From a paper:
The crystal structure of the computationally designed mutant shows that one of the mutations reshapes the binding pocket to favor resveratrol over naringenin through a striking change in its binding orientation while maintaining allostery. I141W, a mutation critical for resveratrol specificity, creates a large steric barrier that alters the shape of the pocket and obstructs the vertical binding orientation of ligands. Resveratrol is accommodated in the binding pocket in a horizontal binding orientation almost parallel to the plane of the tryptophan. Unlike I141W which plays a clear steric role, the other three mutations (C137I, M167L and F168Y) have a more subtle effect in reshaping the binding pocket through nonpolar interactions. C137I mutation creates a protrusion in the binding pocket that increases shape complementarity to resveratrol. M167L is buried between the residues in the binding pocket and the dimerization helix and may play a role in positioning the I141W tryptophan to stabilize its horizontal orientation through van der Waals interactions. F168Y allows the formation of multiple hydrogen bonds with nearby water molecules and may serve to stabilize the structure. A different hydrogen bonding network consisting of D71, R75, and E78 make hydrogen bonds with the resveratrol molecules in chain A and D71, E78, D172, and a nearby water molecule make a hydrogen bond with the single resveratrol molecule in chain B. The DNA-binding domains of the resveratrol-bound quadruple mutant and the resveratrol-bound wild type are extremely similar with an all-atom RMSD of 1.0 Å. The altered binding mode establishes that allostery is robust to major changes in the binding mode in TtgR.
Numbering used by the authors:
A (entry chain B): 3 to 210
B (entry chain A): 4 to 210
Amino acid sequence: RRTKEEAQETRAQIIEAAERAFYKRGVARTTLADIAELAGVTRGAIYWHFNNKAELVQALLDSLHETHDHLARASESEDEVDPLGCMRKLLLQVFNELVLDARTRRINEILHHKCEFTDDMCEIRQQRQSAVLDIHKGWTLALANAVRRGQLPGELDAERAAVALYAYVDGLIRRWLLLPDSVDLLGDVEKWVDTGLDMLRLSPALRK
Amino acid sequence: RTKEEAQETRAQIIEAAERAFYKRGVARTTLADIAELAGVTRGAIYWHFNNKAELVQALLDSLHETHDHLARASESEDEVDPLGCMRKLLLQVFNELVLDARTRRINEILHHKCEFTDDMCEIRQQRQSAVLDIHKGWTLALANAVRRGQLPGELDAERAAVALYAYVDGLIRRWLLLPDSVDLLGDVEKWVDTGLDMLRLSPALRK
Ligand SMILES: Oc1ccc(/C=C/c2cc(O)cc(O)c2)cc1
Ligand SMILES: Oc1ccc(/C=C/c2cc(O)cc(O)c2)cc1
Ligand SMILES: [Mg+2]
Ligand SMILES: [Mg+2]
């Protein structure tokens, strides 16, 4: 009965339908008019909320980080006493949500496997670059905090370690999406997280 | 001769497919689009490829060729240094990615420009088959390294092959996305050894 609350409901309906449409048919061939029909909204309504498909993809991508922001900011805090432990809790929660939450799984599948970078829609690649650079900045600081607190080797190259951890986690998530019944990500989640952290703690190649 | 002409036509089609897929992506490119870009007519592309998924697979299969010698060596139970063969394999994989325009662009197509959205689902099915085949070979090569004492005796060879694939595949994709951020060629030894150190040293990878 109020403008803002009805707008928020319509926006959520559009995003939910976009996840269903992109997951089934992919981003390239899905139109906003298609998503409007699936959502039960008018074309005027969808173009009111989103200028183009790139803005809907970004809404999906930006929706992933809210769950973990509390543990991420803690790991990045220069006053946090256990930054490596916050990083481990962050990685456990990432994997747990991926396996358990149908929405998170479907969005990750869309971004990994149903969404092309093409220069006719250059914003998709540009916004993915910004998201990964932002993650890298956070993890570089979290790992530097861990080194200062004696939880990681003193000569750790924090930048390269953050890249190595991102490579491993992102590669494991994509492998699981491709071949889920191949790897028990939920049952062995602690093992999978600790494999990545062990690389950072123990590999001499990651020292300066 | 018919045989040499058909081989040249196939190569012309595959080269045009790389150009077309890189520019416009796989989803919206048809075989008819690729044939026009290749200068190939009278329906010849359909004599070479049953559908677009087969052309994607041809690009994917072309990546194995350079590395086959080192991969088979690493998997041979007669090889004396199966971990060293795997190291040389990963060095070449990263070197070719940075140096070879064709390998780089094919990887960019498969990682970033190729939706799992075809009718017969063959694009996803063949990617699954390809990764399972890599996994089978890497599990064998790591099991050979364990047998030679080059990796821990209690290593979970299957999980270690998954962890190494995750790291390597993730690092390649990370580099394709942000090439100015990772000196893949300059520090290639460090990047390869970081991954091999994970398998050699992580207790989480032991049974
Ligand atoms: O494949 C993936 C690779 C990396 C990540 C990281 C997510 C993440 C989420 C946060 O809230 C803070 C952060 O610093 C990182 C998620 C998935
Ligand atoms: O990210 C990756 C990029 C390339 C590869 C190649 C693996 C490979 C496996 C084989 O059995 C034979 C071969 O010639 C290559 C694996 C992972
Ligand atoms: Mg969430
Ligand atoms: Mg090659």
